[PDB]
Amino acid sequence: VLSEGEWQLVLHVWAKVEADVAGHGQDILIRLFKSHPETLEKFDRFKHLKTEAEMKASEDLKKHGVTVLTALGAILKKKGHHEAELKPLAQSHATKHKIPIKYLEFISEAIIHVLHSRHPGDFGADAQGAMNKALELFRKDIAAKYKELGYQG
């Protein structure tokens, strides 16, 4: 599992995310959409945005970034005891939203990219390994729930 020392690395940088949840949400979602355009087509709410400036100017997009980060945070502060938290999320993402596991890999990479950009003194290799570990545990757990439900395995 993550060691206590790994968990402290993850939560130290996540407390700096919290100082600007909206801004980090925006940057994470923009990166995802520009690097992996197919992901934007999942969002009836956002599929009209074509350019990076249009994405930056959308207030609703910045709201959904907060939604996302606020749920991610709540999961992380459980330190792996996130069964309750995860269960509604994998349920909607398998059945309603239909989000492949691979696209959760891609938002994982955009999280780490942004955190590197924003927090390089608090996001050395040590903390980057720890963050990667904690995002891989989130994906493993959700993947287990998708399998159970019979969504892309």
Ligand code: HEM
């Ligand atoms: C850190 C990873 C992610 C977290 C914590 C997250 C969290 C959430 C939450 C809390 C909601 C609203 C409640 C719900 O319907 O469950 C939501 C909705 C949604 N998410 Fe996720 N999500 C993540 C990744 C993704 C990815 C990678 C995509 C697409 C590529 C996606 C697509 C959606 C869509 C389409 C909605 C509904 C938005 C709307 O129409 O209101 N999510 N997400």
